[model samples]
Target: ETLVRPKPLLLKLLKSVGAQKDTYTMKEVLFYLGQYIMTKRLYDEKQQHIVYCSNDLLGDLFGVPSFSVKEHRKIYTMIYRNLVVV
Candidate 1:
């Protein structure tokens, strides 16, 4: 006997993130994922965005969770301009 599996939502999410069956780099994957999260209404309230390491992609790009005073203001400005002001 064999068991069947379902992946409807996962497929939808992959498409939502612009991932294809061929191939994708990690940077591209995260970039599209962030864009998907920003635009998609279905996952607006997920707690993953609020956690430190969970937001690795965006956090790495923006230097989040780091205790550096020099880049804090610059990082915040960029985030505000790109995320909020858009």
Candidate 2:
């Protein structure tokens, strides 16, 4: 008899993320995953523009379990200028 094992879902997801290219770095992987999580969009009344909100999603990236000041700063550094009043 032979034993078989199943691949983990995380590997599958990572594979899909990298399928378009031959190589990717951790930053690229994180950025790609961020896109999928940061799907919420907000309208800026004062600036008359649209901003993508990623506090909730970025929090997960920082292992905060939820939105936090630390995550907020991280997101700000990552995509602040694009952000606008909502």
| Candidate that scores best on TM-score | 1
Deviation of model 1 at 49, angstroms = 6.0
Assess every candidate by TM-score.
Answer: 0.32, 0.29
Give the worst 10-residue stretch by lDDT in candidate 2: 1-10
Q: For residues 44-78, what per-residue lDDT tens digits would candidate 2 score against the true structure?
A: 34543333333543332333333322454655444
True lDDT of residue 33, candidate 2? 45
- Candidate 1 lands at a TM-score of 0.32
lDDT of 1 at 76: 44
| Model 2 whole-model lDDT (C-alpha atoms) | 0.38
Q: Alpha-carbon error at 47 in model 1, in Å?
A: 11
**Each candidate: how many clashes?**
0, 0
